[PDB]
């Protein structure tokens, strides 16, 4: 509404990634994740249904419908 503008960066899971705790974000081929902090190459943080935490940028790719 305020911070989120100029089209949000949407990313889609590539490979089946496994989490370790509620601190890390889990995702499987298909589950979409909304980025909240996108840096210049590295680790990206996002949110998912019942799953919230950090996620790699190499196992995910910027998706756009």
């Amino acid at each position: 509404m305020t911070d989120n503008s100029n089209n949000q960066l949407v990313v889609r899971a590539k490979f089946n990634f496994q989490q370790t705790n509620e601190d890390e974000l889990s995702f499987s081929k298909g589950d979409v994740i909304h980025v909240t902090r996108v840096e210049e190459g590295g680790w990206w943080e996002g949110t998912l249904n019942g799953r919230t935490g950090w996620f790699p940028s190499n196992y995910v790719r910027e998706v756009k419908a």
């Binding site: 370790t20 705790n21 601190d23 890390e24 190459g41 590295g42 680790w43 990206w44 950090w54 790699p56 940028s57 190499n58 196992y59």
Partner: peptide, 22 residues
Amino acid sequence: DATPPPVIAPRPEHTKSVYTRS
């Protein structure tokens, strides 16, 4: 399709890594 050799984002000894991750 072409899979990239570099798997998972890089994780140095500094900057990243917080409260230990797995």
